[PDB]
Amino acid sequence: EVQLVESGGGLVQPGGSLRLSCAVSGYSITSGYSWNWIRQAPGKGLEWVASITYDGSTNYNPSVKGRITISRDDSKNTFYLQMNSLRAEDTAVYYCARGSHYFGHWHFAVWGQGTLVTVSSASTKGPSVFPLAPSGGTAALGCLVKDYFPEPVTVSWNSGALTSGVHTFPAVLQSSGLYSLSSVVTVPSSSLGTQTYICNVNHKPSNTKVDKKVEPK
Amino acid sequence: DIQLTQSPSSLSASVGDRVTITCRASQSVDYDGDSYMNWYQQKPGKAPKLLIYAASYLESGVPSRFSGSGSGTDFTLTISRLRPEDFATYYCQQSHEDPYTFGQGTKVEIKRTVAAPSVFIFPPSDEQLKSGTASVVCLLNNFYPREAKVQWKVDNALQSGNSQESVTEQDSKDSTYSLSSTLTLSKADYEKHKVYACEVTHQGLSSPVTKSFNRGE
Numbered sequence A: 001e002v003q004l005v006e007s008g009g010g011l012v013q014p015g016g017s018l019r020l021s022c023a024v025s026g027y028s029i030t031s032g033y034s035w036n037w038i039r040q041a042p043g044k045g046l047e048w049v050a051s052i053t054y055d056g057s058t059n060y061n062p063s064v065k066g067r068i069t070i071s072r073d074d075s076k077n078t079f080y081l082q083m084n085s086l087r088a089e090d091t092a093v094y095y096c097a098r099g100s101h102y103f104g105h106w107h108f109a110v111w112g113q114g115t116l117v118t119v120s121s122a123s124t125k126g127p128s129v130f131p132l133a134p135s136g137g138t139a140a141l142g143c144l145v146k147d148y149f150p151e152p153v154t155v156s157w158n159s160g161a162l163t164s165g166v167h168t169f170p171a172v173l174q175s176s177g178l179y180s181l182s183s184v185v186t187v188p189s190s191s192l193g194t195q196t197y198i199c200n201v202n203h204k205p206s207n208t209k210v211d212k213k214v215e216p217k
Numbered sequence B: 001d002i003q004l005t006q007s008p009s010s011l012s013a014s015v016g017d018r019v020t021i022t023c024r025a026s027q028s029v030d031y032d033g034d035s036y037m038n039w040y041q042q043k044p045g046k047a048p049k050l051l052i053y054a055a056s057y058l059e060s061g062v063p064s065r066f067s068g069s070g071s072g073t074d075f076t077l078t079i080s081r082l083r084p085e086d087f088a089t090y091y092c093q094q095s096h097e098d099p100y101t102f103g104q105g106t107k108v109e110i111k112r113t114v115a116a117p118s119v120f121i122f123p124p125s126d127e128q129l130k131s132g133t134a135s136v137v138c139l140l141n142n143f144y145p146r147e148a149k150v151q152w153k154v155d156n157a158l159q160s161g162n163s164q165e166s167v168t169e170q171d172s173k174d175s176t177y178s179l180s181s182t183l184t185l186s187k188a189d190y191e192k193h194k195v196y197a198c199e200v201t202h203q204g205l206s207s208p209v210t211k212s213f214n215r216g217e
Helices: B127-128
Strands: A005-006 A010-012 A018-024 A034-038 A047-052 A058-060 A067-073 A078-084 A090-101 A105-110 A115-119 A128-132 A138-149 A152-155 A167-169 A179-188 A198-203 A208-213 B004-007 B011-015 B019-025 B037-042 B048-055 B064-070 B074-081 B088-094 B108-113 B118-122 B133-143 B149-154 B163-167 B177-186 B197-199 B211-216
Touching: A005 A090, A018 A034, A018 A115, A034 A067, A047 A067, A047 A078, A058 A067, A067 B163, A078 B118, A090 B118, A105 B037, A105 B048, A115 B019, A128 A208, A138 B118, A138 B133, A152 A179, A167 B019, A179 B133, A198 B037, B004 B088, B011 B019, B011 B037, B019 B037, B019 B088, B019 B108, B037 B064, B108 B133, B118 B197, B118 B211, B127 B133, B133 B149, B133 B197, B149 B163, B149 B177, B177 B197
Parallel strands: A010 A115, B011 B108
Antiparallel strands: A005 A018, A018 A078, A034 A047, A034 A090, A047 A058, A067 A078, A090 A105, A090 A115, A128 A138, A138 A179, A152 A198, A167 A179, A198 A208, B004 B019, B019 B074, B037 B048, B037 B088, B064 B074, B088 B108, B118 B133, B133 B177, B149 B197, B163 B177, B197 B211
C-alpha cells in the first residue's frame, strides 16, 4: 505494498489557504484504519495535526485548531487537509500517515513521502543548470543547480543507474533569496572517455526538467 | 498535552556499539495494563518509519537489533549493535490520548576513524559566465569528522563574505561527510584575477591542502 501519495504542496501566500490530498493505493480498504496528517517544520520535530476515522470522527491538535479541516473522498481513496490563514510557522513537510490499531489506540505504521508547503509571497523561479566538469584513479564531477525558488530540487545521475559516489548537497539560501545546490559524483577516471554522465535535474514547482551532459574539459 | 522528553538530544557511537536512548513522558501513558509509547526512525529526507509500538513490540520486518522497553512515564529504545545505516533521528510518540505527541528526537551519529578529505576545485562553466556570474566550487569528499575549514584565495588574497558552504548528512554506508563550498563573483571581477584556490584545514591533515586553477587554463 500500500502507498500513500501526497500532492497539493508548494507555494502558498501568507494568509492564504492550503489544500493537500493523500491518495491511497486503490486496492486498499480504509475502514480499519485512522488517517492522519503530521507535519515537520524544517529542522524541527514531528507535530501531529489531524485525524479522521471510518465513522467520521475528527480530532485536531489545538496548536492549529480553528483553521484546519480533515476530510475524505473514499470513492477516490483520498483524504484531504485544508488549512486557512497560513503563517510562517506553517511552512513544513506535511505527511499523510495511516494508523493501525493497538488495543483501541493507534500507531502510525504507514507514511506517505511528505510534501513541502512553503508560506511565502515570493515568486517561483526555475534554476539554471551548469556543469561541474572533471578538471589518481578517482575523478569528481557534478552539476550546479543555481537560483531557484522554492525548494525542492531533485537530482539523479544517468536516470538513476548511477547511485554510488553521488553526493547531492543541501541547498543554500543565497542573499538574493534564491536557493542553489550542487550534486556531485566521484567515478573512475578511466571511464571519463567512454562513459556518459548526465545529471537529471527536476524543479517541479517551475516545471523545470533538465538532463545535462557533463563532459570533461 | 503529554510532553515527551528524549535524552540525549544527540549522540555519537561506533559501529557495533550498544545504543540506548530514553524518552520520559510528563505523565503515565499506561492504560489498563499496556503502555502506549511508539518509536520511529527518520532518516534524512525520508518519512518516519515505525519501529516499536506499545513500548516493546517490534513492527513486523524491523531488524531485531531494535528493541524497546518501559512503562508509565519512562521508556527506552535500544540498538543492540549499531550499523552504519542506523544513522537517523529517533522519535518517541505517545498514543495514550489526543493530541498525539512526539519527543524532540535523538540524533544518532556514527563515530569512526578520522579521514582527511579529498579535495577538488571546479572553475565556473562557460555557460554560466555567459550569463554574467562566476561560481567557483570546492568539493571536500568523504571525510570524518564533520568539522572542516575552507578558505578561498583569489590571487593569493584571502576571501571572506563571498562564499557559502553546505555539508551532506552522514553517509549511510561509510559514515563520512562531504562538503561543498561555492565562491560567487561577477563575471567582471572573476576575469580580473588569475589564481583561484581553496585551502582546506581538517584534523586528518597535518598542513592545509590547497587545490587551485589558473583562469583560462
